[PDB]
Amino acid sequence: ATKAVCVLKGDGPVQGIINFEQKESNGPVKVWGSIKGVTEGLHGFHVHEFGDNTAGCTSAGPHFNPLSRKHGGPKDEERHVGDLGNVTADKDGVADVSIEDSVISLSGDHCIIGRTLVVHEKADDLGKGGNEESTKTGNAGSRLACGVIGIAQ
Amino acid sequence: ATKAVCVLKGDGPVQGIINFEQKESNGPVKVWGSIKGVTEGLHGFHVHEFGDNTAGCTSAGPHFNPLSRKHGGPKDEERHVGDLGNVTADKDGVADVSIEDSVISLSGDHCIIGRTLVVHEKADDLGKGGNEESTKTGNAGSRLACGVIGIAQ
Numbered sequence: 001a002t003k004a005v006c007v008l009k010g011d012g013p014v015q016g017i018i019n020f021e022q023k024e025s026n027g028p029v030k031v032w033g034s035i036k037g038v039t040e041g042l043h044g045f046h047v048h049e050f051g052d053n054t055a056g057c058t059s060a061g062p063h064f065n066p067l068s069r070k071h072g073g074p075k076d077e078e079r080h081v082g083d084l085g086n087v088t089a090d091k092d093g094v095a096d097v098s099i100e101d102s103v104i105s106l107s108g109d110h111c112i113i114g115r116t117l118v119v120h121e122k123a124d125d126l127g128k129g130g131n132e133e134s135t136k137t138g139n140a141g142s143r144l145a146c147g148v149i150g151i152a153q
Numbered sequence: 154a155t156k157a158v159c160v161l162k163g164d165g166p167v168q169g170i171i172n173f174e175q176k177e178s179n180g181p182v183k184v185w186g187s188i189k190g191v192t193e194g195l196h197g198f199h200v201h202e203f204g205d206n207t208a209g210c211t212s213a214g215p216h217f218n219p220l221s222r223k224h225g226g227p228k229d230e231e232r233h234v235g236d237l238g239n240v241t242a243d244k245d246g247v248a249d250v251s252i253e254d255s256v257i258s259l260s261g262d263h264c265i266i267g268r269t270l271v272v273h274e275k276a277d278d279l280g281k282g283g284n285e286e287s288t289k290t291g292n293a294g295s296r297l298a299c300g301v302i303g304i305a306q
């Protein structure tokens with residue numbers, strides 16, 4: 001049983017805590033926690049390639065994409081490893097996260113430990129948008145908050 | 154990974170940016186960067202086990218010690234993997250870090266990616282300090298600043 005964790009912070013009000021749990025190597029990873037201080041509605045939620053916060057969330061680079069695929073949603077075959085969709089916030093600006101994903105991992109070449117989890121400004125269109133950027137970033141816009149994913153107890 | 158990075162943050166502000174570089178998996182890791190806002194003198198400098206900053210630096214747990222050894226200095230055979238000795242701050246409160254270490258790694262069982270880098274209140278006695286805590290923590294005191302170590306470009 002591998003566990004990981006991520007504290008999300010940015011330059012505004014957005015903060016969060018996200019936990020990861022993987023009972024078996026190459027089993028599914030349970031993702032759970034809470035994010036607050038975001039606008040009501042969908043916010044893109046991705047693992048970005050680099051655990052680099054040198055100059056804030058920008059330093060994290062593009063979506064974690066070891067298999068060189070196009071951008072998609074977590075339930076698409078054609079997706080980046082880091083493509084975890086959207087979290088959904090209520091009128092109180094709180095998003096309770098409960099995700100299970102079988103593409104990310106906490107070991108091996110799909111390993112997300114030491115990379116950056118990012119919550120975005122706008123919704124991720126899961127690559128179903130009507131432009132070029134949709135199959136690269138999902139049009140989710142700026143990075144509100146982020147954190148490096150670390151090994152947990 | 155051949156490169157890693159860590160942004161250290163703590164009250165002061167204590168602020169730091171530490172870079173890691175490992176040419177080959179069987180080689181040493183070069184560690185360089187800068188830490189500011191600390192008192193003149195020695196500050197213990199360790200990799201802690203968990204990359205968990207849920208409740209701040211305390212959540213990081215003990216020194217990274219995969220081999221179950223006693224605390225030491227980086228030049229000692231008897232040391233924790235996470236034992237990187239001290240960084241030394243001048244009167245301007247800046248520590249310029251330049252270390253090479255043969256025991257930490259950026260892959261395999263001694264991998265420090267996803268763990269927490271911590272700069273301490275006090276000097277680390279490198280396990281030579283004259284009490285029992287010396288061979289566990291080096292008597293380096295409270296955790297001034299920390300960050301999760303991430304994969305870098």
Ligand SMILES: O=c1ccn([C@@H]2O[C@H](COP(=O)(O)O)[C@@H](O)[C@H]2O)c(=O)[nH]1
Nearest residue numbers: 072073074075076084085086125126128
């Ligand atoms: O183009 C899409 C549409 C939906 N989904 C995901 O599928 C989930 C719905 O799954 P189901 O309950 O319809 O099986 C959504 O929450 C969303 O994350 C995608 O990955 N890509």
Ligand SMILES: [Cu+2]
Nearest residue numbers: 198199200271
């Ligand atoms: Cu320490």
Ligand SMILES: [Zn+2]
Nearest residue numbers: 044046118120
């Ligand atoms: Zn993103």
Ligand SMILES: [Zn+2]
Nearest residue numbers: 063071080083
């Ligand atoms: Zn993507």
Ligand SMILES: [Zn+2]
Nearest residue numbers: 216224233236
């Ligand atoms: Zn130690």
